[PDB]
Design an enzyme around this catalytic site. Structure first.
Site, PDB file in Angstrom:
ATOM      1  N   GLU A   1      -4.489   9.876   8.903  1.00  0.00           N
ATOM      2  CA  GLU A   1      -4.918  10.126   7.520  1.00  0.00           C
ATOM      3  C   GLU A   1      -6.083  11.096   7.607  1.00  0.00           C
ATOM      4  O   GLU A   1      -6.812  11.096   8.597  1.00  0.00           O
ATOM      5  CB  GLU A   1      -5.259   8.804   6.751  1.00  0.00           C
ATOM      6  CG  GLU A   1      -6.165   7.789   7.496  1.00  0.00           C
ATOM      7  CD  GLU A   1      -5.764   6.314   7.339  1.00  0.00           C
ATOM      8  OE1 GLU A   1      -6.196   5.443   8.169  1.00  0.00           O
ATOM      9  OE2 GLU A   1      -5.001   6.046   6.389  1.00  0.00           O
TER      10      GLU A   1
ATOM     11  N   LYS B   1       0.808  -1.233   0.000  1.00  0.00           N
ATOM     12  CA  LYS B   1       0.000   0.000   0.000  1.00  0.00           C
ATOM     13  C   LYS B   1       0.831   1.269   0.000  1.00  0.00           C
ATOM     14  O   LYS B   1       0.312   2.348  -0.270  1.00  0.00           O
ATOM     15  CB  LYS B   1      -0.991  -0.009   1.187  1.00  0.00           C
ATOM     16  CG  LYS B   1      -1.914  -1.244   1.257  1.00  0.00           C
ATOM     17  CD  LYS B   1      -2.880  -1.395   0.021  1.00  0.00           C
ATOM     18  CE  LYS B   1      -2.636  -2.700  -0.732  1.00  0.00           C
ATOM     19  NZ  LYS B   1      -3.740  -3.643  -0.474  1.00  0.00           N
TER      20      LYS B   1
ATOM     21  N   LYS C   1     -19.040  -5.062   0.891  1.00  0.00           N
ATOM     22  CA  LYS C   1     -19.886  -4.710  -0.271  1.00  0.00           C
ATOM     23  C   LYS C   1     -21.102  -5.591  -0.240  1.00  0.00           C
ATOM     24  O   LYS C   1     -20.950  -6.813  -0.112  1.00  0.00           O
ATOM     25  CB  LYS C   1     -19.144  -4.931  -1.594  1.00  0.00           C
ATOM     26  CG  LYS C   1     -18.214  -3.803  -1.980  1.00  0.00           C
ATOM     27  CD  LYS C   1     -17.114  -4.310  -2.904  1.00  0.00           C
ATOM     28  CE  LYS C   1     -16.338  -3.135  -3.485  1.00  0.00           C
ATOM     29  NZ  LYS C   1     -15.191  -3.576  -4.320  1.00  0.00           N
TER      30      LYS C   1
END
Lengths: 464, 95, 95, 95
Positions: free
Chosen positions: A192, A117, A229
């Site tokens: 973040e 990442k 999802k």
């Protein structure tokens, strides 16, 4: 070139690929654990071979060497990884190409850079696509506030607490170092920017060896629960044509810049007309189905043709970027065994009844959901992927509603009740749902007790 | 007090009659609800069926609403397994 | 050159494929028309020249017609049937 | 003469070895062909199976080619009907 293909996977996606293979006149080879001996995909192939002997079932589908052993003894020229399992694994991709076999996927470079990442966030910067503002690495508390100072609030502290405020930031960053000294043990502490109520939007990408790179529009996968999802739609009907075009172009940009090969998906988060790269999936996704429907482009075929060296436009036959079609809308729901009146614990057991609906605007990529199949605890819960499609998104919804209601799956619990509620909801039907829509809508979890009169009567008749 | 207390125990809002049945015969009313949950509207079965179940190869129709009916053939009765279970093989509505 | 031979004042068995290449649910339309609705205003169809044409489509009726017995429709109990699927497949299934 | 005559009797072109088997053992060769048409390649079965069939709840795999295999569980044996017939309930390859 290529006569035979082995799918290093199982279930719906293994069957998806065999179908694409068959249509391209390729022979097929399937692999299966002992525990999966009753899986459809095992018998849907031209030949199938036991793997992972003695191992745990999931470990077997991860047994890189034993797969290749089979790939070779079988005579296979290529291996499709599918999705999940080894499909993103570098060691596997490397060892497969190493043994002179085609791995249907992108270049080892791409697996490497996008599997980690940090190298990805790096490669995204180099490509000049905006990522999620992050402290370039972990940081001291004078630095956390410096970070929040530029980019602004709210922000998110990761060992992860949210911090809408300088006060909350001290609170958060010191409670993180306490939460962090007894949880893993270590407490370097990165922060973040935090993206309050975003749409998750991703873009389907194809590239070939001859440097061509097109997008297959986007997919709005915002309807998640516990960031899982649940329903994907396509296009993102919630957002305007141009803003959508811009998100897509930015994924072409990223992929032209690393010279991406085969199929892959570029995840973004989105909020009030800005967008933030978060990932790349160097593989085909479970939700590829809907993009296929709205473009007319068989993605799994393309995948394979690309790995025979072919050219997107010249041989494969795809039009130039701007001439790629956009035919109405499409929706996917994964019908699983997740019992929603038991906190989504995947039910197991023998399936007594299953018949698959059909008709106009229905697509079914079916897993292992058939009369008599023992659902085991080992593999994931998916029974059948249901797509619907129609000019008007309103009607794509109508068809999904009908189908979910048409299904008669007896023997094991399923998530259908949940899905029905979700497509009933005005936030969804409008195309505006966010990632926090499900967790913040308690109304979705009131489920009608179902009367199954057939079943209960037969229980009685049997008892007596 | 009782209406609320009962709603929790059966999982829906009981009509006034359910409430009062519950007051009259509390244990029996709850047992009846288990039976209903496990077995359904046995009320609709012909009496010989309701009392004797079915015979091998027997066919029956159970009317449940106007224009809705369960067609039920019985085709085989399995031997028991080790756990003392049997498998009965019906055709309900052609399945 | 072309020669009129008939009109079918109904939906046809092969409507399916036209639906596929246009995107127009014909049976829906049939019903909406019989509620008095307007093709373009309410139902939502575009003008003649804006009606889509999205590739091609093919239909086959799988029957019991035994082709090694002069297409005499076979009868009997069906033991196995599972319906295939995936991209570019549509199934309007009978019995 | 014989090769042609035989092709008609079994319904395909016999290899030279079939011909000669036919010449050596005519009745037996034809009976073998009936058996083959009715039962298939029983050759592939393990001997105990080939001679005793299956036991309730037994599972077996029959290899037919490299990488092609019939997984066969047996789940029940029906009682006979009036015509002296039974129904056996297998799972062959998850069906």
């Amino acid at each position: 070139h290529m006569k035979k293909l082995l799918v290093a996977n199982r279930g719906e996606i293994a069957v998806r690929v065999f179908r694409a293979c068959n249509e391209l006149g390729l022979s097929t080879v399937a692999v299966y654990a002992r525990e999966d001996e009753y899986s459809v995909h095992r018998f849907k192939a031209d030949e199938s071979y036991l793997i992972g002997q003695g191992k745990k079932p999931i470990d077997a589908y991860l047994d890189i060497d034993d797969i290749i052993r089979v790939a070779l003894e079988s005579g296979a020229d290529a291996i499709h990884p599918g999705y999940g399992l080894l499909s993103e694994n570098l060691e596997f991709a490397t060892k497969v190409r190493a043994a002179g076999l085609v791995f249907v996927g992108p270049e080892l470079h791409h697996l490497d850079i996008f599997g980690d990442k940090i190298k990805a966030k790096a490669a995204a910067d180099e490509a000049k696509v905006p990522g999620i503002p992050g402290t370039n690495g972990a940081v001291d508390i004078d630095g956390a506030l410096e970070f929040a100072k530029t980019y602004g609030y709210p922000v998110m502290i990761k060992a992860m607490r949210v911090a809408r405020n300088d006060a909350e930031m001290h609170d958060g960053y010191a409670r993180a170092k306490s939460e962090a000294i007894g949880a893993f043990g270590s407490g370097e502490i990165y922060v973040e920017k935090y993206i309050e109520n975003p749409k998750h939007i991703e873009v389907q990408i194809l590239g070939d060896r001859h440097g061509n790179i097109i997008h297959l529009h986007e997919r709005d996968c915002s309807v998640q629960r516990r960031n899982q999802k649940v329903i994907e739609i396509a296009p993102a009907v919630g957002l305007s044509p141009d803003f959508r075009n811009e998100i897509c172009e930015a994924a072409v940009k990223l992929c032209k810049n690393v010279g991406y090969v085969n199929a892959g998906t570029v995840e973004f988060l989105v909020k009030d007309d800005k967008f933030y790269f978060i990932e790349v999936n160097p593989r085909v996704q479970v939700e590829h189905t809907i993009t296929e429907l709205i473009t007319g482009v068989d993605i799994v075929q393309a995948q394979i043709l690309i790995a025979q060296g072919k050219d997107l436009h010249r041989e494969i036959g795809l039009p130039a970027q701007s001439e790629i079609p956009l035919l109405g809308s499409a929706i996917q729901c994964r019908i699983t065994t997740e019992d929603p009146q038991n906190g989504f614990l995947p039910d197991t057991g023998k399936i007594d009844t299953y018949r698959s609906p059909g008709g106009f605007g229905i697509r079914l990529d079916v897993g292992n959901a058939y009369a008599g199949y023992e659902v085991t605890p080992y593999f994931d819960s998916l029974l059948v992927k249901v797509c619907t499609f129609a000019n008007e998104f309103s009607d794509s919804v109508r068809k999904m509603d009908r189908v979910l209601h048409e299904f008669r799956i007896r023997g094991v619990k399923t998530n259908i009740p949940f899905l029905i509620n979700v497509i009933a909801n005005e936030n969804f039907t409008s195309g505006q749902a966010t990632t926090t829509f499900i967790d913040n809508t308690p109304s979705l979890f009131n489920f009608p007790r179902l009367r199954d009169r057939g079943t209960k009567t037969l229980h009685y008749l049997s008892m007596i | 007090t009782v209406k609320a207390d009962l709603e929790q125990k059966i999982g829906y809002e009981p009509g006034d009659h359910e409430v009062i049945s519950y007051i009259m015969y509390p244990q029996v009313f709850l047992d009846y609800q288990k039976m209903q949950r496990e077995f359904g509207a046995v009320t609709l079965l012909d009496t010989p069926t309701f009392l004797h179940g079915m015979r091998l190869n027997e066919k029956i129709e159970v009317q449940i609403e106007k224009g809705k009916t369960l067609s039920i053939r019985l085709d085989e009765i399995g031997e028991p397994d080790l756990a003392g279970n049997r498998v009965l093989f019906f055709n309900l509505n052609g399945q």
